[PDB]
Design a protein around this nucleic acid. Structure first.
Ligand SMILES: NCCC[C@H](N)CC(=O)NCCC[C@H](N)CC(=O)NCCC[C@H](N)CC(=O)N[C@@H]1[C@H](O)[C@@H](OC(N)=O)[C@@H](CO)O[C@H]1NC1=N[C@@H]2C(=O)NC[C@@H](O)[C@H]2N1
Lengths: 104, 62, 117, 52, 88
RNA sequence: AGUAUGGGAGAGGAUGGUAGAAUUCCAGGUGUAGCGGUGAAAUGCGUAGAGAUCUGGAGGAAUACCGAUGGCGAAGGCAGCCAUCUGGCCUAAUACUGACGCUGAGGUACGAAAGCAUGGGGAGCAAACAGGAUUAGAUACCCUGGUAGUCCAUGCCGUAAACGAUGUCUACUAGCCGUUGGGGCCUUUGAGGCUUUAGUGGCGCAGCUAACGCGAUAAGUAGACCGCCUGGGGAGUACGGUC
């Protein structure tokens, strides 16, 4: 399969549903197949510029291995979830498991 | 975005500010935005600039 | 009637004119002056002296509202920005800061054609 | 270099937010390309401002 | 796109000897597999002229190799075209 | 000449999403006589409230900085970021086929911009056109407006100073200094110094040229194949034909 790295920005008002959404996505990836090499919750951070009249957001980092169907459903779920204001998905070669900066 | 000091004089503030602006070089973009430059003209200008740069480098090495 | 201690000066200085407007924060205008409003018609409207005379007029007009310190924003490649910022200090305000806010497109709309003078 | 290393990303950014040229920073061309990609990704992630 | 396993399967099926990769049979089989795989891509993207150039190059290379094989050994040529279903 | 396996760089192509800056328009708050434009003016906009300033919304087009005598592509050409599909190139060592090559009349594919057909879209710009200036006259250059078009989908057209004004392929012939993507070696700790390869630049010995100039990216020394020229106009024109 292909390794992907996903960064999600969650609305600070929905900060206490992030665990539920993360577990749901992890369960979907696992039932497809999936190897969640890394998952980090950077926390609630201030934004460099306001997004959607908001100044803070919850930052979530995931590194997954999945197939085309898992990717398509994951992206569609990200699009339709209103708590997620901005998501970045980048493909990577190699699985990255070490702790990253901003994990503090 | 120049912030004056406590006892900072007005003329010194104006001066420090507009070569802060000269360092920023916004006025160059403003001048560029007055008229449309065709791609052929832009490429000719950039080629001339590259030639001048290379001739300057040789002189400064010598 | 309304009193306010802190305000912002906006100097819109083009190559044909220079408008100085004194507002309070959140962008509510209090007094404004232009080179056209002090005579200086036509080509003479762009000289730095006209920018100066518009600037003191605006400063004195705002003195009625009674602001002692202000922050300055200059936009445009005008010849009168020097005079406009200088005249406020002569009027007697305290300049907290001064910044340039000329908008820069990130390769947006096509500008008009070149003049073949 | 990746987009998460905000401290190094700021070392090549002016106070306005513009990317600093390689002719000024003395960097290699490939490193400069990677740096520009990382900066553009970090701006999208709202980690660093686009301007100012 | 074909993968290493598919290419190895084709090579093993059409090899004339051990560690044989350069024989005209192997080369023509690989080119035929690649062309048949790219047909589907060019159905979806009608205006990918830049990739169609590489497809045309593959077709030309296969034709040249088939002509060379026919010149050298007729029986091998007929066997290969029959195996891959090529009309000529 | 080609094939399999590892590694690498790239604005190469196609599809779909998405981000920020700016212009225009709309609505609202603050606010009041100008704004705009030029060599100078005028046409134009504004007291049913402009311009300026702040907040929100709509839409289209293009991607600042990085950016480079940089990169990729047969050429035409290709720049925000992300995913999917996909072509070529570079680089190391073995392994494999065994001349399978070069060029190419006809033929065929691609081919900037403008233009054409059907249907959408339309912010900014702007042929045609309207008005204001200038002028002996203005038919133009300047100014205020402004429709095709520029954008998208599906096709056509097949032309450019489509240029390096330099057809493709191969071998050989002093050196010096840059730069991009790789390979190797050496210091000795991490950044430098030698080479080699494929591109991209500046000088320059020999040689060549009417001269200007070219000079391992030849316009030098040789070979293979193709295209083209034969004084200037008439003329890339008429007739015939193909599209
Ligand atoms: N497998 C090989 C792969 C090859 C690769 N693909 C490309 C390649 O390698 N080609 C070989 C180089 C041939 C070159 N094109 C011929 C040439 O250079 N001039 C043409 C002869 C004109 C005349 N006899 C000399 C002349 O007037 N010189 C001027 C002059 O020096 C100077 O101007 C002025 N006013 O003083 C300079 C700066 O403006 O410009 C030059 N003029 C120019 N400089 C440009 C340039 O080099 N190119 C493009 C074009 O723009 C050129 N004109």
């Amino acid at each position: 399969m292909r390794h992907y790295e996903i960064v999600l920005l969650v609305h600070p008002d929905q900060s206490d549903q992030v665990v539920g959404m993360v577990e749901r996505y992890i369960s979907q990836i696992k039932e497809a197949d999936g190897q969640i090499h890394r998952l980090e919750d950077w926390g609630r951070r201030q934004l460099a510029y306001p997004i959607n009249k908001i100044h803070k957001a919850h930052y979530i980092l995931m590194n997954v291995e999945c197939g085309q169907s898992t990717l398509d459903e994951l992206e569609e779920l990200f699009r339709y979830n209103d708590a997620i204001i901005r998501n970045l998905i980048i493909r990577r070669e190699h699985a990255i498991t070490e702790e990253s900066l901003l994990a503090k | 975005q120049v912030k004056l000091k406590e006892g900072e004089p007005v003329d010194v503030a104006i001066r420090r500010f507009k070569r802060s602006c000269e360092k920023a070089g916004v006025l160059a973009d403003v001048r560029k935005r007055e008229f449309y430059e065709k791609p052929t003209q832009e490429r000719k200008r950039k080629k001339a600039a590259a030639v001048k740069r290379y001739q300057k480098k040789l002189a400064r090495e010598s | 009637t309304r009193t306010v201690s802190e305000g912002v000066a906006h100097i819109h200085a083009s190559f044909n004119n220079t408008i100085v407007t004194i507002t309070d924060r959140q962008g509510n205008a209090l007094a404004w002056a232009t080179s056209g409003g002090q005579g200086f018609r036509g080509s003479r409207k762009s000289t730095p002296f006209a920018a100066q005379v518009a600037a003191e007029v605006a400063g004195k007009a705002a003195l009625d509202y009674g602001l002692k310190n202000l922050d300055v924003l200059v936009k445009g490649p005008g010849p009168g920005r020097e005079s406009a910022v200088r005249a406020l200090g002569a009027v007697g305000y305290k300049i907290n800061s001064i910044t340039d806010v000329t908008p820069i497109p990130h390769n947006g709309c096509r500008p008009p054609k070149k003049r073949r003078v | 270099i990746d987009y998460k290393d905000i401290d190094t990303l700021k070392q090549y950014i002016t106070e306005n937010g513009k990317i600093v040229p390689s002719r000024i920073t003395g960097t290699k061309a490939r490193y400069q390309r990677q740096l520009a990609l990382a900066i553009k990704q970090a701006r999208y992630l709202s980690l660093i401002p686009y301007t100012d | 796109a074909l993968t290493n396993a598919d290419r190895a399967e084709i090579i093993a099926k059409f090899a004339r000897a051990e560690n044989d990769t350069g024989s005209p049979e192997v080369q023509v089989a690989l080119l035929t597999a690649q062309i048949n795989d790219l047909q589907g891509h060019f159905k979806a993207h009608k205006h990918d002229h830049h990739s169609r150039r590489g497809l045309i190059r593959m077709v030309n290379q296969r034709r040249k190799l088939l002509d060379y094989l026919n010149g050298k050994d007729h029986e091998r040529y007929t066997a290969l075209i029959g195996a891959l279903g090529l009309r000529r």
